[PDB]
PDB file of C-alpha atoms and ligand atoms in Angstrom:
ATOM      1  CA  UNK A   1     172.326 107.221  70.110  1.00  9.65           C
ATOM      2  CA  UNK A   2     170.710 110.542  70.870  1.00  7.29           C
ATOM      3  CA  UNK A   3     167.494 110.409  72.879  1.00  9.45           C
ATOM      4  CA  UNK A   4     164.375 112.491  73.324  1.00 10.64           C
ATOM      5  CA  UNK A   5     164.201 114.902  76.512  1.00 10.70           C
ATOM      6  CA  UNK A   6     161.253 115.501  77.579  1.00 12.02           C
ATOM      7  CA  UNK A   7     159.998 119.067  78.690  1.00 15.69           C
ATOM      8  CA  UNK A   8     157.277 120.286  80.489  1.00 16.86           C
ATOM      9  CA  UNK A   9     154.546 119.816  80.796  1.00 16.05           C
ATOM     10  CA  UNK A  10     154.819 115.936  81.258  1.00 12.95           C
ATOM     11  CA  UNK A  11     154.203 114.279  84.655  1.00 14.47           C
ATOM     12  CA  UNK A  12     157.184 111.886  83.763  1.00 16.38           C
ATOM     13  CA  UNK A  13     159.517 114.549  84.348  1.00 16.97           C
ATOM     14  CA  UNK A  14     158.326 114.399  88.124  1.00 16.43           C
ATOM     15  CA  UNK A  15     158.686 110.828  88.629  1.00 16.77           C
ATOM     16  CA  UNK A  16     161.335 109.655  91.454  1.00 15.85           C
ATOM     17  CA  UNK A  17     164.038 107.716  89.993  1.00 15.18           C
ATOM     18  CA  UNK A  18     165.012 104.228  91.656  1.00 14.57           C
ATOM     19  CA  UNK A  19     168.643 103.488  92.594  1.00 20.51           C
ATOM     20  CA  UNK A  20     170.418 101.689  90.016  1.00 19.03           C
ATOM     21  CA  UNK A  21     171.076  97.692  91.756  1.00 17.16           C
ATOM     22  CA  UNK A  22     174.045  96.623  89.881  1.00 18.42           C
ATOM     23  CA  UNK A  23     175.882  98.734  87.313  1.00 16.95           C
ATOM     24  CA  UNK A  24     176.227  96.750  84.243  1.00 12.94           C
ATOM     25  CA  UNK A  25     176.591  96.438  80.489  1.00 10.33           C
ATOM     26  CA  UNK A  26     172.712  97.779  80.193  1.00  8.81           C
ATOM     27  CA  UNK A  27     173.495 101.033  82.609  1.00  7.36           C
ATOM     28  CA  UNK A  28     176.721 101.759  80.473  1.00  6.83           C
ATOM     29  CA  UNK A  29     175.039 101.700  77.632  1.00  7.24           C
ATOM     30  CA  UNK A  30     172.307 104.288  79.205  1.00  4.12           C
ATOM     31  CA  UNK A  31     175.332 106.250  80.307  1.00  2.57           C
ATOM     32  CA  UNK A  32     177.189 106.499  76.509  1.00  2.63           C
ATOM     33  CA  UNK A  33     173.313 107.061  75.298  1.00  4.02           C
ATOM     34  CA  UNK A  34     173.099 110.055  77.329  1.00  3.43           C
ATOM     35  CA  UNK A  35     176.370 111.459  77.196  1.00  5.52           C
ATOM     36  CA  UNK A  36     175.529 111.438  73.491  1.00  5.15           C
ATOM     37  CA  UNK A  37     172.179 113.246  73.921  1.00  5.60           C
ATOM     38  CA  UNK A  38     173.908 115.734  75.872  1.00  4.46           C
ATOM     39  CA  UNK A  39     176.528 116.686  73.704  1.00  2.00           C
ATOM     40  CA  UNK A  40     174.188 116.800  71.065  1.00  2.00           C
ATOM     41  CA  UNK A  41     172.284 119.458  72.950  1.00  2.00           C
ATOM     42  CA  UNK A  42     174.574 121.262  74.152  1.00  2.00           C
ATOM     43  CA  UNK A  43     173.892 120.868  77.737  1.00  4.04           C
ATOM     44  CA  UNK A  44     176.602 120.339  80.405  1.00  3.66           C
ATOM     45  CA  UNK A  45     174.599 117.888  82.672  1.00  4.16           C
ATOM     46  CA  UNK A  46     171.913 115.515  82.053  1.00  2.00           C
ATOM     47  CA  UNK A  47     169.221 113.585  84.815  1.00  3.26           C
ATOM     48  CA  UNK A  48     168.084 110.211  83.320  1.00  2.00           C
ATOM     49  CA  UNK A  49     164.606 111.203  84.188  1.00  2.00           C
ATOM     50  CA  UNK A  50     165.205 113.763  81.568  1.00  2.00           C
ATOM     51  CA  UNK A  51     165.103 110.872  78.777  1.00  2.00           C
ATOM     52  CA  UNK A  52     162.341 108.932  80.532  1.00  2.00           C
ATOM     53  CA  UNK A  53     164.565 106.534  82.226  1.00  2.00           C
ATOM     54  CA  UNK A  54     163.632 106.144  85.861  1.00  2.00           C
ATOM     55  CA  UNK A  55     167.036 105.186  87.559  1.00  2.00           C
ATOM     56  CA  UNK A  56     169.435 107.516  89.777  1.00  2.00           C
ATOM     57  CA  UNK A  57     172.061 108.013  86.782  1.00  2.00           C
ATOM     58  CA  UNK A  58     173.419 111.857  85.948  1.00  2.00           C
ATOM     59  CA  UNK A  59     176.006 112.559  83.165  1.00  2.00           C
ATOM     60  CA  UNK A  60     178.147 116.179  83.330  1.00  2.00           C
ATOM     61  CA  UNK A  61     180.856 117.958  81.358  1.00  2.00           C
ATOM     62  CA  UNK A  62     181.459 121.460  82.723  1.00  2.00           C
ATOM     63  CA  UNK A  63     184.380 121.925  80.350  1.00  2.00           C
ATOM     64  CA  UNK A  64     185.373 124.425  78.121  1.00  2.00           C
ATOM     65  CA  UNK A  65     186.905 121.320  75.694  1.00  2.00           C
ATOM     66  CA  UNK A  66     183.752 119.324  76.345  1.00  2.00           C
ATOM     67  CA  UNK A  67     185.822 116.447  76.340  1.00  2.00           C
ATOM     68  CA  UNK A  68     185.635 115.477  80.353  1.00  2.00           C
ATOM     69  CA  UNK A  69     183.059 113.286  81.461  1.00  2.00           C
ATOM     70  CA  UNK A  70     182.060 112.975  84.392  1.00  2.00           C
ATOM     71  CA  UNK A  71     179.346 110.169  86.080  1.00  2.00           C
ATOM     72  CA  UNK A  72     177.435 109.848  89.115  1.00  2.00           C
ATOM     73  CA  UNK A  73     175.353 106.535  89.323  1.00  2.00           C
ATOM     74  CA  UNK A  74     173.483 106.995  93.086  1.00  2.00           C
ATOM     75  CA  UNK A  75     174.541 110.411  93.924  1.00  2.00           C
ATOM     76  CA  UNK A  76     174.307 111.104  97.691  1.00  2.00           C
ATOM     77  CA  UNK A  77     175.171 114.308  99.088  1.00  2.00           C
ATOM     78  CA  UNK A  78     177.442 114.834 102.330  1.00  2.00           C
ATOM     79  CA  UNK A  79     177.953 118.424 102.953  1.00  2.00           C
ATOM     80  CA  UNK A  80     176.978 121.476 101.051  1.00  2.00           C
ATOM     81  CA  UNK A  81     178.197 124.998 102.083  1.00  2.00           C
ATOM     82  CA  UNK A  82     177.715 128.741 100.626  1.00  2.00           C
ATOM     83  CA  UNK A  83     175.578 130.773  98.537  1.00  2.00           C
ATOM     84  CA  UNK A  84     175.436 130.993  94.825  1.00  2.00           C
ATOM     85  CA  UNK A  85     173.301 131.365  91.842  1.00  2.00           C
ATOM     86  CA  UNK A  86     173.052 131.655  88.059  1.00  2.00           C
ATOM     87  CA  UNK A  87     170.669 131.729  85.294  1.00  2.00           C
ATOM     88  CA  UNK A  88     170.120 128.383  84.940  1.00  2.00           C
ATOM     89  CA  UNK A  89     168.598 126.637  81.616  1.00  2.00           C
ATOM     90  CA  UNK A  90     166.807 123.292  81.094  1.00  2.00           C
ATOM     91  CA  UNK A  91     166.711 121.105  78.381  1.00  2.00           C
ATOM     92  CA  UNK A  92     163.077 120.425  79.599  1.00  2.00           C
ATOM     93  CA  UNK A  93     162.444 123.414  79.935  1.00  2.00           C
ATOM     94  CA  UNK A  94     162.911 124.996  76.537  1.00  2.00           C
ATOM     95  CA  UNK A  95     164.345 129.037  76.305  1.00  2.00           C
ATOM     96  CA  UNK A  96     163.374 129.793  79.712  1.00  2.00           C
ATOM     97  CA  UNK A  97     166.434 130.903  82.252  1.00  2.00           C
ATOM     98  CA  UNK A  98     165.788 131.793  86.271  1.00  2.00           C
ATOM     99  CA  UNK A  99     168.253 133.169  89.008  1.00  2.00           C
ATOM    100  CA  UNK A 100     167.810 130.057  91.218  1.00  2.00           C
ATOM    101  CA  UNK A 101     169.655 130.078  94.883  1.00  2.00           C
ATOM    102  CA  UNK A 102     171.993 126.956  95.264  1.00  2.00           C
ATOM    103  CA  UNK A 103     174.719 126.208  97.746  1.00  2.00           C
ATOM    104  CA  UNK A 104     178.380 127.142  96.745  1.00  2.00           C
ATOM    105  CA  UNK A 105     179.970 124.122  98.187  1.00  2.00           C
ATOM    106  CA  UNK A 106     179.026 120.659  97.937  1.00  2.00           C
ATOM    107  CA  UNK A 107     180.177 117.085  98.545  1.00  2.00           C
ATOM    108  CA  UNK A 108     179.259 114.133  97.157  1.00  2.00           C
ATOM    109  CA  UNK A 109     179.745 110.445  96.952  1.00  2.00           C
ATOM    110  CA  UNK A 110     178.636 108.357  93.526  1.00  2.00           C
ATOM    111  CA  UNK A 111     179.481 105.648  91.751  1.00  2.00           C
ATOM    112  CA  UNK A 112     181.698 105.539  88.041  1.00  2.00           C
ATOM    113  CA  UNK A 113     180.779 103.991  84.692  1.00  2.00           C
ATOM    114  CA  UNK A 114     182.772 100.708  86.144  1.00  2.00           C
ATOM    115  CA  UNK A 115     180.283 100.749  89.281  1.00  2.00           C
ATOM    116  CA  UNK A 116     183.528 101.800  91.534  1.00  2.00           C
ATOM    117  CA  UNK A 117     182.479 104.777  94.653  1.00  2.00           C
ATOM    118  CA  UNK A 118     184.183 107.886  94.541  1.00  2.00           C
ATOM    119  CA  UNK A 119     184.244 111.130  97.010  1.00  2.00           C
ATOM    120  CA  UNK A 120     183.859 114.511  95.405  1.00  2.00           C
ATOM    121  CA  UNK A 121     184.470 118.164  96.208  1.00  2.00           C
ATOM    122  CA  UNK A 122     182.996 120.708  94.020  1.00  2.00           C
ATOM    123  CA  UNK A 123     182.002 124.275  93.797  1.00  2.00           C
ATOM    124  CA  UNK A 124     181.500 127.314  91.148  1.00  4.66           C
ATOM    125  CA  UNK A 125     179.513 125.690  88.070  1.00  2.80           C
ATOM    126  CA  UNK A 126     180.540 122.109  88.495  1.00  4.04           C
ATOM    127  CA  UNK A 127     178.578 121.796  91.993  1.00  3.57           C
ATOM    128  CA  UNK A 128     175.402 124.299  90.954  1.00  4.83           C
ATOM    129  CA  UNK A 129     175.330 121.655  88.148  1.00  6.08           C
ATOM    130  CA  UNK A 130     175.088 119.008  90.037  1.00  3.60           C
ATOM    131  CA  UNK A 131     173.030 120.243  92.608  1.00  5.50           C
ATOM    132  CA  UNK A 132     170.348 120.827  89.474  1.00  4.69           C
ATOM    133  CA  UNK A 133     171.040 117.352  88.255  1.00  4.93           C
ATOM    134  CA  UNK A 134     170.455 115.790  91.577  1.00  7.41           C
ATOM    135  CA  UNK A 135     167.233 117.505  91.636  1.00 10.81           C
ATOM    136  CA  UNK A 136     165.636 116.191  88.519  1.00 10.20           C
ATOM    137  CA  UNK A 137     166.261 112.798  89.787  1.00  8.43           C
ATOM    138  CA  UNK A 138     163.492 113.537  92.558  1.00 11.07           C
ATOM    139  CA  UNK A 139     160.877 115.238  90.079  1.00 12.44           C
ATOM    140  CA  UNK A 140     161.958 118.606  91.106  1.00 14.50           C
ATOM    141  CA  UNK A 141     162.823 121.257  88.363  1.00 17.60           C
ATOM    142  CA  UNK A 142     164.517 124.453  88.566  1.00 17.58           C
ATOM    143  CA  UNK A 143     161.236 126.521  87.862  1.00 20.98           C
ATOM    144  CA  UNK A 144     159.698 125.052  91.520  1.00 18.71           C
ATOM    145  CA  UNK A 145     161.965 127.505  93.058  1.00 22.07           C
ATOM    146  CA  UNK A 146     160.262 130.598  91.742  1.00 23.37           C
ATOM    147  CA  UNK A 147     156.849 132.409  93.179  1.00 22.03           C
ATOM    148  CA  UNK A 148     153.946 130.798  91.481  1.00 22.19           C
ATOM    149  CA  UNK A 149     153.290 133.487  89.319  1.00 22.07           C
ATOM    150  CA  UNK A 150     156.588 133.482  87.397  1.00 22.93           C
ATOM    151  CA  UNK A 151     156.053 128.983  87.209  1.00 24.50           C
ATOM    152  CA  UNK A 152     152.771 129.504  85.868  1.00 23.71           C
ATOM    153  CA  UNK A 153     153.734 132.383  83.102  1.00 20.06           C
ATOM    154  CA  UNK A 154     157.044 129.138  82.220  1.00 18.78           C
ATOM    155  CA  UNK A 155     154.706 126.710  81.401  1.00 18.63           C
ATOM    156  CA  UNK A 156     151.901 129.690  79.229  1.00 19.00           C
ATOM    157  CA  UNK A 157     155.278 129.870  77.472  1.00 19.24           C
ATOM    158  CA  UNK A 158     156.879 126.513  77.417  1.00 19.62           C
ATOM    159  CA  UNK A 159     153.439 125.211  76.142  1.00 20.90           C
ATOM    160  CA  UNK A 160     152.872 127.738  73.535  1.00 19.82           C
ATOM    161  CA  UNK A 161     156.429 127.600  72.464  1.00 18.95           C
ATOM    162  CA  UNK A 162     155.749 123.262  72.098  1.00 17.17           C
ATOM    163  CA  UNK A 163     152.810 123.730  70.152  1.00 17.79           C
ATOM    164  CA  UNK A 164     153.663 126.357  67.490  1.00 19.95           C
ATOM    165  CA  UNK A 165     156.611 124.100  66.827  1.00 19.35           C
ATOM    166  CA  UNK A 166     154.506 121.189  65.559  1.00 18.98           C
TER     167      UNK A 166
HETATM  168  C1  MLN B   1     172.177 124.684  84.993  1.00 19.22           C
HETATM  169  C2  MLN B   1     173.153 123.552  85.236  1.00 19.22           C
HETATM  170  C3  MLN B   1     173.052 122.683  83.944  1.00 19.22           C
HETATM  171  C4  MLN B   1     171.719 121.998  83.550  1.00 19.22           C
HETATM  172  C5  MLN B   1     171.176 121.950  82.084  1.00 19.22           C
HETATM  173  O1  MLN B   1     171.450 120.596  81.869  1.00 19.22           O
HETATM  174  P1  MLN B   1     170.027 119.567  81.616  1.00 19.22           P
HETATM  175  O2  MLN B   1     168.994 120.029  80.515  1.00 19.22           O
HETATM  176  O3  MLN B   1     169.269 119.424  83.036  1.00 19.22           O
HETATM  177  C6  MLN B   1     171.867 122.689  80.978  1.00 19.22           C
HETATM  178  O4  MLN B   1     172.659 122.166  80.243  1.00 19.22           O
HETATM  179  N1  MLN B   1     171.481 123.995  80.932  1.00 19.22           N
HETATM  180  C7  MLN B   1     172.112 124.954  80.031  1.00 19.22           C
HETATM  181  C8  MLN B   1     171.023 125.423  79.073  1.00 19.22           C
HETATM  182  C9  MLN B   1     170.625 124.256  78.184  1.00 19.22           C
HETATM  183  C10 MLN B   1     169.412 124.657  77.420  1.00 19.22           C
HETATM  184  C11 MLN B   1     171.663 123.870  77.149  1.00 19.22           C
HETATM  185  C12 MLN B   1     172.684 125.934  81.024  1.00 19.22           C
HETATM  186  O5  MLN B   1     171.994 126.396  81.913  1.00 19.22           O
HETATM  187  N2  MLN B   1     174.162 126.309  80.874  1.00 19.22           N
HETATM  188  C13 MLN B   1     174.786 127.225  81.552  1.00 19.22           C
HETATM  189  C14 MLN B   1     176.202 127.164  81.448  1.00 19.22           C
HETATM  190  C15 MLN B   1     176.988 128.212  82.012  1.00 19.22           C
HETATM  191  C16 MLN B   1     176.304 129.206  82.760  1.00 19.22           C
HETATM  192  N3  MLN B   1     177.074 130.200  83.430  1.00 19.22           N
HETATM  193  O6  MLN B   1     176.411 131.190  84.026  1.00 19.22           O
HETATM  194  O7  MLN B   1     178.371 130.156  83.482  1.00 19.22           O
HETATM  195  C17 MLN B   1     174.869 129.248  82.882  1.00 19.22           C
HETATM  196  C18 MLN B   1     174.112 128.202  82.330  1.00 19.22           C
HETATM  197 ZN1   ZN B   2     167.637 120.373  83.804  1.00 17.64          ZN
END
């Protein structure tokens, strides 16, 4: 069932998530329920803190099908390698895109939907995605990367943009 993402400004979207204990019924249900609320979006990643759920889950489809899943319950990075960027987008962050610098290269290990570890090598989208996802699950957001100026004209907007549509 599709769930409400938050945007800024809300503190909750700062909070650090916890590391999930034991991967169970309850997480996998948090996992379809975000997948869902993704898709419905349109976004190709999604950080639990996102939907105001304070554990270290992240949910990605990089696709062009959008019909591969992939799940990282307790990433942890290894290596990370390269220079890259994009204009990145936030669901939390509503119509507001920003170069952002991110490493080409990265390697992770995670756990599945069925609480089972797994090694991973990405680059190009798949690992700028994750490197965003990672961060939201320590209260960082893309737009802390920018000079202060260009942060504080996001939220003018962002908040304007939030309170015209109500
Ligand atoms: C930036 C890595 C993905 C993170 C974001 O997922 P969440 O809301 O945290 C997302 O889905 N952002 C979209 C915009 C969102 C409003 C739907 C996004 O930034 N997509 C995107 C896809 C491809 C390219 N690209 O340059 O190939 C840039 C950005
Ligand atoms: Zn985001």
């Amino acid at each position: 069932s599709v769930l409400q993402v938050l945007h800024i400004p809300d503190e909750r979207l700062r909070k650090v998530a916890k590391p999930v204990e034991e991967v169970n019924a309850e997480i996998q249900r948090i996992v379809d329920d975000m997948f869902e609320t993704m898709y419905a979006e349109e976004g190709i990643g999604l950080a639990a803190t996102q939907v105001d759920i304070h554990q270290r889950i992240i949910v990605i489809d990089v696709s062009e099908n959008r019909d591969e899943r992939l799940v990282l319950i307790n990433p942890e990075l290894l290596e990370k390698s390269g220079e890259t960027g994009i204009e990145e987008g936030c669901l939390s962050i509503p119509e507001q895109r920003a170069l952002v610098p991110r490493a080409e290269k990265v390697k992770i290990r995670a756990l599945d939907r069925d609480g089972k570890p797994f090694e991973l090598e990405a680059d190009g989208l798949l690992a700028i995605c994750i490197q965003h996802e990672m961060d939201h699950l320590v209260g960082k957001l893309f737009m802390d990367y920018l000079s202060p100026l260009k942060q504080q004209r996001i939220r003018q907007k962002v908040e304007k943009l939030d309170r015209l549509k109500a």
